[PDB]
Amino acid sequence: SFVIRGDEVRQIAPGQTGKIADYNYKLPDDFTGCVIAWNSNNLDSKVGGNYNYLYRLFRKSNLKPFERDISTEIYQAGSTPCNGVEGFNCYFPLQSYGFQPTNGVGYQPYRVVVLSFELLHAPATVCGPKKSTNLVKNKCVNFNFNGLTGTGVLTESNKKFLPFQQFGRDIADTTDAVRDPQTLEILDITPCS
C-alpha cells in the first residue's frame, strides 16, 4: 500500500519504465497479482498543500522487483564526491508531493493497493469461502484440492508424504497424489478408466 500521484498510476505494471517504476517500486515481469487504486484528493490533501508524502527520484541504479529502499544518502550528481553535504551537484534523493485540492486530476493523490499472490506449492494458508463436500473414495470424481482441479479416482495409499509436502507429481507433472487439507491423510489420484 502507498499513495502516489495520478500520473504515476500507470507505472504500477510489469515492464513499465518511469520515475516511480525504476526508483520507488518495481514490478517483476511474471507478476501474479492485482493492482487496485482510487482517488483520495478529499483525504490526503491539505488546504495549503500536504507535503508529508515523499517519493524517490534520485538513484543511480534501477530497482530489482519487490525492493524496499529507505536510503537517505545524498546523490553524487557531479564528478566531485559529496561527503554527506548537499548543494551543488549533491542532491537530497527524495521529493515531497505537493497535495493541494485545487490541482488537476493527474496531480491528485491516489491510494494504491497492490496484491501479490505467491502461487508456490506449499501448505496453503489463504483460501476462499467454498462449501466443503464429503470426500468419496474409489469412485470417478471431479475433485478440487485447494484450487487444484482434476478428474480421477481417489484411493487410500501408502506413499509417505513428508510433513512439508502437499502435492505429488508424476513424470509429466500430473498430480499423482494429494494430502487432504482437512484431515492429514494420504490419497492417490488415478484417472478414470
Binding site: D170, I171, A172, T174, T190, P191
Partner: peptide
C-alpha cells in the same frame, strides 16, 4: 502412461511364434 499413451498387444502371441518356429524347425 496415463496421458492417452497406450500399447496395443500384437496379433500373434509368443506361444504362436513358438509354434511357428517349432513347425518350421520340425519341417
Amino acid at each position: 502412461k496415463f496421458n492417452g499413451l497406450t500399447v496395443l498387444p500384437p496379433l500373434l502371441t509368443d506361444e504362436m511364434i513358438a509354434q511357428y518356429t517349432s513347425a518350421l524347425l520340425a519341417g
